[PDB]
RNA sequence: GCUAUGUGAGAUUAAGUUAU
RNA sequence: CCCCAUAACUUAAUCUCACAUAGC
């Protein structure tokens, strides 16, 4: 009908056009966050009444303004007219329009809301958090509306990859501002809500793209003045599209205006308390919980990861320059030193030095090698630098020259090469082929590997849903004991290996070790747990075969961080490696049927197995600085009875100061480390594990969140989701109840082989059919949200039949064969790789084969398991390196003959070309 | 064949860089980039191309002597 | 078969306490050569930080540090404030063009004189071939060197 | 009845493993010092050795363009910079003879490397652009004969 | 009992080497 | 200049345990 068009437009002189037909209501499909008795979590529903009404401009232009008429009952209708005359003078609520239609006889209550957008906050923060790049129409939309991008950006092939087309960062980057509004709009109606006296919830799904805010049903009013709104759900949800968006780039303008210039800030000020608390309370002014500038004062690891997110999303804001040690002018003997005095972290705030020795009159070996390490010294006695090679902060030239390092090309091993084409390799069409070898580089190596933290953005977690997820996966870390060790108790192997920068100038770390007396070391760890010591960490290009022309580099941390961490963390990290049967399958060897072994741990239970692998891409320079502080945290958590508060703190402060936030130095000048985990530290492989049960338990949670609980069939995981609700955005403390739940249905749904940065996972079919558990979707959509990187189906694998085993695990394929009387899965790796192996060696020396038939008995250890490949191709290389080993040694043989008249007294080389000697290291009697 | 291409471009780098190509920062990224846009070909036509690339950049200065290195 | 004191103890048991004592001088031998060791990367260490603070400028660094309220400045501007000397690397002319100028440019405030321009190659670089038309025939991680004009 | 050849089985296995070890530590001693001669003979001569493989494998390969390029070289015409692969750019490729000129440029085209490149600046030794003439059969004295042609790929 | 010798099982300890 | 961690092989010693033999 024609009457009620011009009904819904009244006083206001708005030109409308119906987005439905007729007087009927409009059904949309938007993401609504819900919690009821019978329904709770964050997914898309329908909603059926509302009818929409598009505005059109003069000239006929449809614009972003829709009228949406909700019908409903006459209670909420006089209710919800209650509570707007209450906050009908607030500027950030969305103008309402009660009337009353007859329909059909019965006139229908009406509350009509004027010039709304067509989508909502939920609506972005579900399209953001819950990304899918075919069923991604709600943020094509979105980024085409407000304008960021022309409708051709999408054109492009990886336009939301992070790492390709890094111009995804501005297109979003646009809403920030935005987003920026939206919160100020919602602090307006937060103390317009306190201020009058209304209590309620606050939902994403009730505010427009604008800021507006309506839908006032579920308000109750109490005496003015009194008023409490929850903005827990609201609040959490939004945070990690504070940060994808930068919604804090306009408070670093003089007036906070994005037109005006930047505001200068004194280079020497580095405190920035009072701006945080001012930034706290100027956009999260409701949020109850207490927030720590510095986390120095903060109770037990819990304030540290809240106030933690809350520091690194309010020091995008401060300039990067005041970010690192805070050095002073201490005197040792006379002689004015300049030395750090603490450290400002981006999420740990000002952390003081508590052992501070102005005037000194000799330093013992403990003070002179914590001022080595320190790089106060090398950046202040050093000369400015401007690297516009990379984005990364340059602080200072150590010398007067840059250090080029090129990459060598590996050596050729001609005969092992021609003894394998006389014995019909590399043939064309041959199913085995060359594609691993010793890929050279120029000397803009170093550099550019290092400039891959670009790739590393300021991430902002959900702390609602983190402070479960670290619990679940403190559960997960369980059955380990750990603690503090003395210098005693501390195995080093291979203790000579660099002893880190600047000790290489003056040996090993041998010396180092050998030279610090144990007493020494329990005074320099001591003194760890009260100081923060920065260090200098050196990048090395690695020389070793791979199959890609990406140079790598590791980097060598200083001896003072790794004797230290080794105190902290070596009765942890060895439990785990000598644990058998858990999720971390750190230390299980593949040999004498370990392979089995772990496979049939994670087949456990399950009712419709299916496998499920990832490769994270781009690790070690895009994880979030937050998830790293959250994996030390988690390793730090068997130490309630050796260290305090705040020993832990400080502990936690040194190594985000020398592994986090750490003086990177490429070439010979000091670069800043944006973030991330260090290849060589001390822990890499277990934080890696830890960060990998993370952002897995995460993706079942919020797949099981996202699911329509009026869908779920089994009334015991719809209760599990309406707790696992509660207790994510409605609870504060632990429950440990379910926590042990959730726990078990993640173990009894969800096996994992996690290892370093790899993992397998034997899940549930048809659970994961009805979206219970985490899939491959689910995974992409939570890495794009808490990594800021696109993982591309390519990298992943499935598999649907258990009688094959995991695609591809630790570079090795999985295999059932017969040994024996009974199936068991074999390891094989890609023949391709133990041939390059066997070709190309890294030095002079190795192409020698005579003086190593060694090397070769190793490489065909592990090229045992290809014997039994149904592929002919395969199984011939093991018997090649066989036959290559006996060469190997008749000729050392005949050598020894021509050079001396000596044989050997020999007879137990034989076993190095039979099947024998490798097959019995596959069978599990030892 | 890739087999016998792959390999000798191995063995001329690793010569080059022996007789000290790599103080010429231009050459050694021509010679670098050859080189490893070789070790990744898919077709030996457009791979030998790189090869010859790769090639004359010994044959170019006259370090090495040729004529004794092909009395076979 | 009475005298097994004279190859079982006189010749054994004799020889017993030697393999133990051998191994102690060992180890002090060790030891020793562990505190020379000490002692050598102790005087490295102390020469290394007594030398690197001569350089230290103290005449513009000791006007920062007093000008700060608690005395702690943050490191990342100690380079920026009173270093003397800037290396600046190039890798394409558009950013010496734009990051860079003739003999004098200015970046963190300052002024900074240019007393050199040299290349990845380290031989030298003249200020006069750096142009759009010379570019290809140079290598581009040019490194210029500058002084702080004042 | 014991202890004539029952006492000689445990004093005659004593000086039989004495000299088990001592052979031993001999053979060790031996394989070591193997270990070390072959060694450093290798890293010795590892240019020589390295060319040698390099040039066996170049004509194990039976190409043409490098067959050419090669043989050019051994008596004659060796490039002055990398040889492009695309249309464009130029190549200077020295011609030191008479017999050179004619066995690669004929006439505006110059063989090498199994392309046929253009000619575009015959220039001497020193620098005079020597025009397409004196080059011909007729006694050429173009100053050193080293005629450098630039030349273009087609 | 007493040394003497070999034996195998480890375990321990470094060194070299591969794989991840 | 050349990282942390794990597994495996190879060599070489050691502390023995245990077994066996011989002499006393
Ligand atoms: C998505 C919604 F469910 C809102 O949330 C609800 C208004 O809020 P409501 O009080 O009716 O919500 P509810 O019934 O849960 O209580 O209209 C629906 N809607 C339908 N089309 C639109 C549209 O174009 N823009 C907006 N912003 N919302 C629209
Ligand atoms: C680089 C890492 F820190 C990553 O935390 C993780 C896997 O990272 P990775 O390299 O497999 O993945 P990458 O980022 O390349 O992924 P793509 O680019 O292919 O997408 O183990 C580490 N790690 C890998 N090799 C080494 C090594 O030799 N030494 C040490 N100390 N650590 C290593
Ligand atoms: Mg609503
Ligand atoms: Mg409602
Ligand atoms: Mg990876
Ligand atoms: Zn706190
Ligand atoms: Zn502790």
């Known amino acids: ?926 | 064949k890739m087999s016998d291409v792959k390999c000798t471009s191995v063995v001329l780098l690793s010569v080059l860089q022996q007789l000290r190509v790599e103080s010429s920062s231009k050459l050694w990224a021509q010679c670098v980039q050859l080189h490893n846009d070789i070790l990744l070909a898919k077709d030996t036509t457009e791979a030998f191309e790189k090869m010859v690339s790769l090639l004359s950049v010994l044959l170019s200065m006259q370090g090495a002597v040729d004529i004794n290195k092909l009395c076979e | 078969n009475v005298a097994k004191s004279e190859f079982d103890r006189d010749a054994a048991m004799q020889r017993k306490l030697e393999k133990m004592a051998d191994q102690a001088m060992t180890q002090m031998y060790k030891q020793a050569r562990s505190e020379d060791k000490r002692a050598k990367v102790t005087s490295a260490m102390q020469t290394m930080l007594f030398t690197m603070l001569r350089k230290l400028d103290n005449d513009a660094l000791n006007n920062i540090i007093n000008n700060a309220r608690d005395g702690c400045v943050p490191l990342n501007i100690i380079p920026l404030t009173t270093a003397a000397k800037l290396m600046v690397v190039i890798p394409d002319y558009n950013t010496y063009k734009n990051t860079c100028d003739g003999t004098t440019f200015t970046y963190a405030s300052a002024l900074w004189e240019i007393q050199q321009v040299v290349d990845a190659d380290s031989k030298i670089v003249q200020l006069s071939e750096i142009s759009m038309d010379n570019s290809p025939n140079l290598a581009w991680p040019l490194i210029v060197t500058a002084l702080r004009a004042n």
Request: aromatic share 14%; glycine share 4%.
């Open chain 1, 1 to 926: 009908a024609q009457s009620f068009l011009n009904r819904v437009c009244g006083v206001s002189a708005a030109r409308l056009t119906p987005c439905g037909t007729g007087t009927s209501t409009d059904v949309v499909y938007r993401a609504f966050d819900i919690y009821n008795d019978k329904v709770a979590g964050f997914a898309k529903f329908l909603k059926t009444n509302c009818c929409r009404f598009q505005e059109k401009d003069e000239d006929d232009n449809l614009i972003d303004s829709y009228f949406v008429v909700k019908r409903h009952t006459f209670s909420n209708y006089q209710h919800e007219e209650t509570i707007y005359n209450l906050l009908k003078d607030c500027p950030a609520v969305a103008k309402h329009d009660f009337f009353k239609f007859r329909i059909d006889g019965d006139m229908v209550p009406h509350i009509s809301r004027q010039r709304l957008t067509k989508y909502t906050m939920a609506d972005l923060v579900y399209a953001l958090r819950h990304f899918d790049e075919g069923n991604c129409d709600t943020l094509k939309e979105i980024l085409v509306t407000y304008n960021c991008c022309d409708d051709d950006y999408f054109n492009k092939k990886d336009w939301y990859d992070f790492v390709e087309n890094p111009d995804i960062l501005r297109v979003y980057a646009n809403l920030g501002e935005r987003v920026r509004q939206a919160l100020l709009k919602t602090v307006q109606f937060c103390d317009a809500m306190r201020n009058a006296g209304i209590v309620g919830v606050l939902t994403l799904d009730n505010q427009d793209l604008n800021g507006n805010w309506y839908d006032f049903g579920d308000f109750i009013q109490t005496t003015p003045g009194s008023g409490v709104p929850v903005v827990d759900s609201y609040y959490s949800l939004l945070m990690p599209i504070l940060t994808l968006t930068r919604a804090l780039t306009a408070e670093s303008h003089v007036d906070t205006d994005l037109t005006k210039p930047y505001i200068k800030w004194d280079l020497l000020k580095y405190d920035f308390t009072e701006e945080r608390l001012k930034l706290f309370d100027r956009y999260f002014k409701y949020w109850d919980q207490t927030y720590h500038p510095n986390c120095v004062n903060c109770l037990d690891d819990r304030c540290i990861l809240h106030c933690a997110n809350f520091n690194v999303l309010f020091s995008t804001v401060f300039p990067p320059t005041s970010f690192g040690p805070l050095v002073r002018k201490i005197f040792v003997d006379g002689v004015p030193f300049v030395v750090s005095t603490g450290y400002h972290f981006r999420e740990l705030g000002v952390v003081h030095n508590q052992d501070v020795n102005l005037h000194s009159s000799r330093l013992s070996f403990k003070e002179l090698l914590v001022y080595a390490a320190d790089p106060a010294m090398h950046a202040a006695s050093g000369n400015l630098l401007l690297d516009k090679r990379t984005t990364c902060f340059s602080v200072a030239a150590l010398t007067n020259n840059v250090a080029f390092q090129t990459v060598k090309p590996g050596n050729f091993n001609k005969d092992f090469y021609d003894f394998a084409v006389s014995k019909g390799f590399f043939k064309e069409g041959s199913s085995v082929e060359l594609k691993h070898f010793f890929f050279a580089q120029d000397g803009n190596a170093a550099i550019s590997d290092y400039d891959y933290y670009r790739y590393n953005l300021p991430t902002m977690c959900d702390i609602r849903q983190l402070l479960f997820v670290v619990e679940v996966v403190d559960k997960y870390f369980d059955c380990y004991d750990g603690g503090c060790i003395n210098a005693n108790q501390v195995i080093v192997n291979n203790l000579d290996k660099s002893a880190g920068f600047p000790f290489n100038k003056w040996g090993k770390a041998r010396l180092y070790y050998d030279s610090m007396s144990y007493e020494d070391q329990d005074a320099l760890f001591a003194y760890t747990k009260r100081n923060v010591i920065p260090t200098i960490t050196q990048m090395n290009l690695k020389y070793a075969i791979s199959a890609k022309n990406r140079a790598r580099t590791v980097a060598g941390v200083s001896i003072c961080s790794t004797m230290t961490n080794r105190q902290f963390h070596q009765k942890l990290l060895k439990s785990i490696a000598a644990t058998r049967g858990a999720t971390v399958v750190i230390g299980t060897s593949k040999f004498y049927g370990g392979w089995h072994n772990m496979l049939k741990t994670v087949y456990s239970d399950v009712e419709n197995p299916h496998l499920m692998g990832w490769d994270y891409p781009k690790c070690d320079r895009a994880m979030p600085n937050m998830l790293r502080i959250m994996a030390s945290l988690v390793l730090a958590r068997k130490h309630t009875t050796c260290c305090s508060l705040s020993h832990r703190f400080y502990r936690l402060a040194n190594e985000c100061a020398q592994v986090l936030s750490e003086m990177v130095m490429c070439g010979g000048s000091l670069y800043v480390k944006p973030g991330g985990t260090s290849s060589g530290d001390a822990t890499t492989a277990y934080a890696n594990s830890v960060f990998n049960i993370c952002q897995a338990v995460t993706a079942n949670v919020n797949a099981l969140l996202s699911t329509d609980g009026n869908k779920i069939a089994d009334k015991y995981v719809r209760n599990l989701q309406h707790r696992l609700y509660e207790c994510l955005y409605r609870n504060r403390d632990v429950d440990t109840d379910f926590v042990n739940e959730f726990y078990a249905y993640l173990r009894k749904h969800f096996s994992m082989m996690i290892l370093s940065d790899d993992a397998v996972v034997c899940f549930n079919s048809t659970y994961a059919s009805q979206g219970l558990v985490a899939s491959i979707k689910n995974f992409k959509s939570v890495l794009y949200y808490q990594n800021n990187v696109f993982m591309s189906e390519a990298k992943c694998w499935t598999e649907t039949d258990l009688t094959k085993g995991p695609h591809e695990f630790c570079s090795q394929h999985t295999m059932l064969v017969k040994q024996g009387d009974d199936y068991v899965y074999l390891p094989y790796p890609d023949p391709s790789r133990i041939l390059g192996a066997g070709c190309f060696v890294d030095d002079i020396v190795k192409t020698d084969g005579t003086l190593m038939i060694e090397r070769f008995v190793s490489l065909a250890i592990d090229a045992y398991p290809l014997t039994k490949h149904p592929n002919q191709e395969y199984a011939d290389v093991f018997h090649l390196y066989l036959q290559y080993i006996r060469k190997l040694h008749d000729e050392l043989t005949g050598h020894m003959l021509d050079m001396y008249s000596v044989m050997l007294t020999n007879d137990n080389t034989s076993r190095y070309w039979e099947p024998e000697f490798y097959e019995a290291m596959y069978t599990p009697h030892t």
